[PDB]
Paper text:
In addition, helix A has a discontinuity at residues 49 and 50, with the final helical turn (residues 51 to 54) oriented at 55° relative to the first three turns (residues 38 to 48). This final turn is inserted into a pocket between two of the long central α-helices (B helices) and the 30 loop. Density in the cryo-EM map suggests that this dominant, discontinuous conformation of helix A is in equilibrium with the continuous conformation seen in the crystal structure. The two different states are potentially stabilized by different rotamers of His106 in the B helix and Thr30 in the 30 loop. This region is among those with the highest temperature factors in these and other published HA structures, suggesting that it is conformationally unstable. In the cryo-EM structure, it is also a region of lower resolution.
HA is synthesized as a precursor, [name], that is proteolytically cleaved during virus replication into the two disulphide-linked components of infectious virus [name], HA1 and HA2 (1–4). Nevertheless, cleavage is essential for fusion activity. It generates the HA2 N terminus at a conserved hydrophobic sequence, which is called the fusion peptide because its synthetic peptide analogs have membrane fusion activity.
Residue numbers in the entry:
A (entry chain C), B (entry chain A), C (entry chain B): 8 to 501
The structure:
């Protein structure tokens, strides 16, 4: 008739997702993303990090030079992958502080070996065994030299090697533990051995232990592996009177990003920055629930399987009660499921007809704030390489308990941080979208000084004759109240 | 007279509690809970966890089989409790890596012992001492076998025991350290002993040390305790030429939730899930300030003695200035101390009389949001069992420094998390209660289109004749402005 | 003319600082502080902590009593400072568990030495060497006693020392490692040494190692340093048959706040509570980016170089478009750069003239909330003394990896806490300043019931004749609407 109705509202959707905030345990929204990566392809991608697959070789057999591990000489890696089908097929051995040696060689990232001229005098070199067959003949570790009595004598050995280079040199050496008192004299003339290996600042002395051990590949004897690092400017001395497994050369040492991982996943051709023991995962999401062990740029490990970030507004599903008069309704009531052009918009009822449109500035302002919110506080990426061990096969006691306690403390503190951040950010999102709605209302109310009244459905009963051009002026922000003031005041108050 | 007054407000209380928020260091509220448990009954509750009280026995004397500890054979526990009055009354001994053995046996949770048929040949078994009297006679540890020379000989001993079962076997053994060179030959024919104990993958060799030590229970000699774990499929070999304290059998090994705690509190009949060394505490509150050492489902340890969570709204104490005309006042002014039915409510001044009532929907909405707020972010419970040691009696150096540094880092990071969460949640509570108040006001203002005006005390001067039925209609949400519009407009503007 | 204009606004500045919030990556403010200390004077301040500068002495040479370190006898410290130019000039030595001994002596905080009467019988005391010249003569460590054969004999030594005091006693002792089999017999008659040192509860036995090592100051022989702690009530026994470096007395042991730091900064006269290896830094700011190593009350280490806390409101720079009519504009439009008396204020356009003033209560309320905000959640100070090592010169393996992993976990968790707190607090600051603005508006609107209208520039077109006294009444809070109601209603609606 003589008056007009102009209402404000926001878009609704039929199928919405539940989220969690500070104030409510579940609310419904128009749209929500996932922030926890729960899946893996099950394969290890070979770019961009250099992957070296050990097949039946451990890293400690590859370094000593076991015969089925001779493909690995002078190799380099970013990540070394060990398989659970790996075995040993040479002289039986133990390494005191095995975990320490494995970690030191993994972080160096190379098996570069330089043969040096060591002069062993009055002894027979290149000792062998049928526990280590290289071809039909007997053999031994390619990087160690078994020394034994020449004629009926083993002289006190005294050799020196100086570092005049500008890098560090790692020497691997050992000692033979014979099973009887009748084997010692047969190989090394003496009855009790001794091996001393020293620099200017450090020393180690080992004595051999004699007695019977379980049979492994036809022997009840064992070797024990040791190591020494010689710095630039320092000297090495070796002084043994019996039972010495001599070094043949040194290994170069580098500082870099190299590491080691126990996996059973196949290796494939693809590009992925994060590797887990369950295969490579993508790094688009900030958190991950696949595995606590990782390498390269990776998401943070949390205990949760799902965290949903509200990327839209609240979803009051349109009351399916469609008015008989098709009464335009507002935001205080419900959402509008018939709006596609934008989030916030205007519906006008006029003599001319019913109509609809969308507001660009309001929608854009909400979208710009919402895009990249998580990016503001937590970092895009976090690269880590060589870390600690997080899974154990044996019981050890104190140090293993401390390692397990340090990892659990870290996981519980990053899981609490991930729960609070999603609830805080979800709250702030619902608040900014709701204030934006009420901001367009106050703007509309301010332009209509005394020529409109509020109904409380989210609607402004305008008390003059508004045509399409007049509605368009309000929408734009050029509505001139003075023109229709007299007519509206005479219509509303009399 | 011809007009009416309708005011909105919220309840006040006389005695209120101070809280802390992001924005203010102290604010007064109607009601507040405590979140830090500061007290204990001083007793250890025997349900639901199985408590085994050691009386004068340590866990390492119970395992070796000291005579005053024979009540403990084949025992099982969830928590083992050690007392400060505990002592030793057998052969004097030391355990290298004592802390490691104590932690391994505590997490297993049993003293199940299976005697095995070991054949010691050419030696005299069941050696004894008057430092360990079981009855009037001499005695020894019930689980160890002291072996000595038969006639004038001690043969090289070589025995083997295979694991064909499907579980792990823990063997405890040792070595005797005699005080002179004249005692060695007297017991074991040789002048220098040796004990080797090996599997397929591991070995240990110990040599004995001779010399004088302080007198303990009439002896200057000592025993040293060692241990070996044999996995399913593996073998054990023992090869000693002198000074062997032989094993008698193995201990079963389990993986579970068992642990050990040093306390002096009495044990009583009651049900409590959390145990501390100061007695059992309840687990209703999220944080605790009693002790950093804990077992079972327990609250998190923080440094603070008090953290108060606002469970009510702000408390503007009713200005005791009671108006002479008894002028109804609103929320912008003060609180209402005369309201019991609900938090938010209406007071009406009419020709009929003064009156009061309460609003249910508004009060319920505030209460539902406030109930269970903390439950949304922090977890209800956190069960932990075997952890690290947090109190030390000796100085050790590096490892102890790292253990103390790891615990302090955890406490400072959980104390900062507990301070921020209470301040954040308290802020959000005050905000939601204040917005709820302003929401009922806008609802009231919207229903009274042009028949009422705002005074600014929190009151609506209605400009027609409102009776009890009219006030009731506003309160309900069925007020029909059109009926009194003409009368009110003629009364207010002319 | 017949009407008046009264507008509300807030102060603007020309040069503003960008900050970061939850909702926006950069916003402009009137004023902002820095919270990260990035600079140091480069000197170590000598008050209030007692600094003891080692010059060419390490703490382990000062304790043994090397000749160039005799100024350090009976010294005490809170912090001991080691220099990179330090060297050794006595008998060459190694300490097994060197890191453990250095940490134990540093936390005690004294070199107090009590000479005790030990009776060495049948041996020659005060052995010497030209590797340690004290004057022209040969010399040795001042706190150790080299013992050697008297005539042609070295008796088995058996001595005892009881603790009857009420404090702990630290004894430092050692063993000589000779380079040949011809040097052993020459000094100590036997061919193989032994040193046993025991209490009632503990024992250590060391055997000497013979062989050649690199030359240091004309010797191929070395000493190995050991230690024992004897508690109140306990006894010490020493039982050596050769190669004993005997103790001369004990060191007192204290529990306190003492520590050690490797620095190269000069020591100066000034007062500073926090010391770093880059010199003393002030502790006014909560975070610091100078160094992860610290001593005393210090700010927390974070990875960031800058974190800016908004201490003012938002800065909408005054549109330099100055109205031709000099139209007073409000807050919805821009800020006011012409206001110095306060933040929030009123500008009045009247027949009398244009004018300006400031509101005290509103400005004060905002300032009081903003002052000390950070103080509410994070603690003013955090004192720490003896901690762990955070920089290493050698590769060691497992324990060093765990130490490095524990420090990185702590740094990443405190850097995430510092990023979120600044973004949260900055958001809350912008919100409280903006609500304060809208609170003065509603107060102004409420006082002008029907005698004013809103324009939407932040202005109230008052529809009567307002003079300076009338404007002053509004500003005060004594404006009486009734007086001008009839005139304003006849002017605005007709
Ligand atoms: C101290 O005590 C230990 C433990 O008792 C002794 O160690 C044992 O020594 C014997 C003799 O060396 C070892 O016996 C050998 O076992 C080999 C492996 O056996 C496996 O494979 C065979 C074939 O499949 C199976 O039958 C068997 O069950 C195992 O699965 C055998 O292959 C060896 O065979 C040799 O002898 C036979 C004789 O018939 C010949 O036909 C062969 O050609 C070959 O020469 C042999 O039987 C035994 O394994 C050791 N046990 C362990 C676990 O260590 C020490 O000998 C003892 N030392 C001293 C000094 O007393
Ligand atoms: C190397 O050096 C060490 C240290 O000097 C020597 O060790 C000492 O050896 C002697 C002899 O074995 C020990 O003496 C014994 O002490 C026992 C405990 O004494 C406590 O209780 C008594 C009674 O209450 C108190 O008087 C005393 O103050 C203590 O509180 C005594 O009970 C023993 O008594 C025996 O001898 C007496 C003689 O009168 C008889 O009446 C008794 O029946 C009994 O046979 C005895 O006196 C002494 O404790 C050791 N000290 C320590 C601390 O070890 C080594 O002997 C020495 N070794 C060599 C090889 O030289
Ligand atoms: C086992 O094997 C080791 C390693 O080979 C041997 O150790 C070497 O032993 C020799 C002899 O003791 C050491 O030689 C000595 O070196 C001293 C230091 O040399 C430095 O300074 C000089 C002078 O500036 C430089 O020329 C040199 O390059 C070094 O920078 C010399 O000062 C000693 O001099 C002595 O002899 C000379 C002879 O001309 C006299 O003039 C002097 O007065 C003085 O008496 C001497 O040359 C050598 O350093 C050892 N090397 C290492 C690194 O240990 C063991 O001897 C050997 N042991 C056995 C038992 O076989
Ligand atoms: C493993 O690597 C070593 C070291 O070689 C270095 O590392 C490799 C991975 C490559 O990057 C090389 O380019 C790099 O130099 C190899 O040692 C090398 O061995 C050869 C043969 O013994 C040496 O050649 C000798 O040179 C001398 C003259 O100096 C002649 O007298 C000899 O007749 C002979 O030609 C070469 O110098 C040496 N390189 C060194 C020491 O750097 C090693 O062969 C290699 N092994 C395998 C299996 O690949
Ligand atoms: C400690 O426990 C062991 C092992 O017994 C097992 O653990 C207990 C806590 C209970 O749960 C038992 O049900 C469980 O089996 C006891 O060992 C047992 O000892 C007895 C007596 O030596 C064995 O009986 C023998 O059986 C053989 C036939 O196999 C006969 O020839 C013998 O004459 C005799 O009857 C029994 O088999 C054995 N159980 C085993 C090995 O599992 C042990 O006695 C017990 N000690 C105490 C003090 O309670
Ligand atoms: C290092 O310190 C010790 C211990 O002295 C104590 O610590 C100091 C830092 C000061 O605070 C002292 O006040 C404190 O006591 C010194 O030991 C002392 O040595 C002297 C000389 O040998 C002892 O005096 C003797 O006393 C006896 C009688 O008991 C007489 O028979 C002797 O003739 C002689 O006068 C003094 O008792 C002793 N103090 C003790 C044991 O506490 C030490 O001299 C000192 N060294 C240096 C270089 O300063
Ligand atoms: C990625 O690989 C890891 C293994 O490296 C997978 O974790 C493993 O998941 C299984 C199934 O949940 C766990 O088995 C269960 O163990 C418990 C405790 O022993 C037992 O009670 C159950 O009956 C069952 O055997 C297994 O323990 C677990 N391994 C570890 C060490 O956590 C993980 O599921 C894989 N993830 C993906 C996404 O593929
Ligand atoms: C629960 O039991 C623990 C002990 O297991 C109690 O902690 C102890 O409290 C006392 C009193 O505060 C502390 O004593 C003080 O120690 C300091 C530092 O040495 C000293 O300067 C004081 O003079 C006083 O002796 C004691 O150290 C502390 N023990 C520990 C290891 O923290 C605790 O109070 C008990 N709590 C409850 C609620 O019962
Ligand atoms: C306070 O002193 C510390 C040293 O104790 C200073 O840290 C050092 O800063 C320099 C320059 O950034 C670092 O050098 C660089 O190291 C990297 C990695 O090796 C290398 O790639 C670069 O080429 C360069 O050499 C040095 O490593 C670093 N030291 C440590 C251990 O962090 C610090 O800058 C000083 N701070 C102030 C405020 O004076
Ligand atoms: C909900 O908002 C998210 C924003 O993360 C939209 O997510 C994108 O959806 C498309 C669909 O093809 C994906 O290809 C993109 O990778 C998503 N992310 C980005 C980077 O835009 C999602 O489309 C929105 N959902 C609806 C229904 O609009
Ligand atoms: C303040 O609110 C708390 C909510 O925690 C009320 O606390 C309850 O008080 C009763 C009093 O008998 C206890 O028995 C309950 O255990 C408390 N908790 C629960 C679970 O309801 C408290 O009553 C309120 N105070 C006032 C004055 O109303
Ligand atoms: C911005 O607010 C800060 C509050 O931290 C003001 O900082 C003070 O500035 C004076 C300038 O002489 C310093 O001496 C003080 O140490 C600062 N802190 C305190 C404790 O007041 C700063 O002045 C303000 N800036 C402006 C332009 O007003
Ligand atoms: C208000 O609503 C109640 C039902 O909740 C009803 O009993 C009462 O009659 C209503 N009062 C009116 C319409 O005045
Ligand atoms: C406003 O209040 C002040 C006191 O703060 C007073 O001096 C002044 O006269 C008052 N002005 C009025 C009522 O116009």
């Amino acid at each position: 008739n003589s008056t007009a109705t102009l209402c404000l509202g926001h878009h609704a959707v039929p199928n919405g997702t539940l989220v969690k905030t500070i104030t409510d345990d579940q609310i419904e929204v128009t749209n929500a993303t996932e922030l926890v990566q729960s899946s893996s392809t099950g394969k290890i991608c070979n770019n961009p990090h250099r992957i070296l697959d050990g097949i039946d070789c451990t890293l400690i057999d590859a370094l000593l030079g076991d015969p089925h591990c001779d493909v690995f000489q002078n190799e380099t890696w970013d990540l070394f992958v060990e398989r659970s089908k790996a075995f040993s097929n040479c002289y039986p051995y133990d390494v005191p502080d095995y975990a320490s040696l494995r970690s030191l060689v993994a972080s160096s990232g190379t098996l570069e070996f330089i043969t040096e001229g060591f002069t062993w005098t009055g002894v027979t070199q290149n000792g062998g065994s049928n526990a280590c067959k290289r071809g039909p003949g007997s053999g031994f570790f390619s990087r160690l030299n078994w020394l034994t009595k020449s004629g009926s004598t083993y002289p006190v050995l005294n050799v020196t090697m100086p570092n005049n280079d500008n890098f560090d040199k790692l020497y691997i050496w050992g000692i033979h533990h014979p099973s009887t008192n009748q084997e010692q004299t047969s190989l090394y003339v003496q009855a009790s051995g001794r091996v001393t290996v020293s620099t200017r600042r450090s020393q180690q002395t080992i004595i051999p232990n004699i007695g019977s051990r379980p049979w492994v590949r036809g022997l009840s004897s064992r070797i024990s592996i040791y190591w020494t690092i010689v710095k630039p400017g320092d000297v090495l001395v070796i002084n043994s009177n019996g039972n010495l497994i001599a070094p043949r050369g040194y290994f170069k040492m580098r500082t870099g990003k190299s590491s080691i991982m126990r996996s059973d996943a196949p290796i494939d051709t693809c590009i992925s920055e994060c590797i887990t023991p369950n295969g490579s995962i993508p790094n688009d999401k900030p958190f991950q629930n696949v595995n606590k062990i990782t390498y390269g740029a990776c998401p943070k490990y949390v205990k949760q399987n799902t965290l949903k970030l509200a990327t839209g507004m609240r979803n009051v599903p349109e009351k399916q009660t469609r008015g008989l008069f098709g009464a335009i309704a507002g935001f205080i009531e419900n959402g509008w499921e018939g709006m596609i052009d934008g989030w916030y918009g205007f519906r006008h009822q006029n003599s001319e007809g019913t109509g609809q449109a969308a507001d660009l500035k309001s929608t854009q302002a909400a979208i710009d704030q919402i895009n990249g919110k998580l990016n503001r506080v937590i970092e895009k990426t976090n690269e880590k390489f060589h870390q600690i061990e997080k899974e154990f096969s044996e019981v050890e006691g104190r140090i293993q308990d401390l390692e397990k306690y340090v990892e659990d403390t870290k996981i519980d503190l990053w899981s609490y941080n991930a729960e609070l951040l999603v609830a805080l950010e979800n709250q702030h999102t619902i608040d900014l979208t709701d204030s934006e709605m009420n901001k367009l209302f106050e703007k509309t109310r301010r332009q209509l000084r005394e020529n409109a009244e509020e109904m409380g459905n989210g609607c402004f009963k305008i008390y003059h004759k508004c045509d399409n051009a007049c509605i368009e002026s309000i929408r734009n922000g050029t509505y001139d109240h003075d023109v229709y003031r007299d007519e509206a005041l005479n219509n509303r108050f009399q």
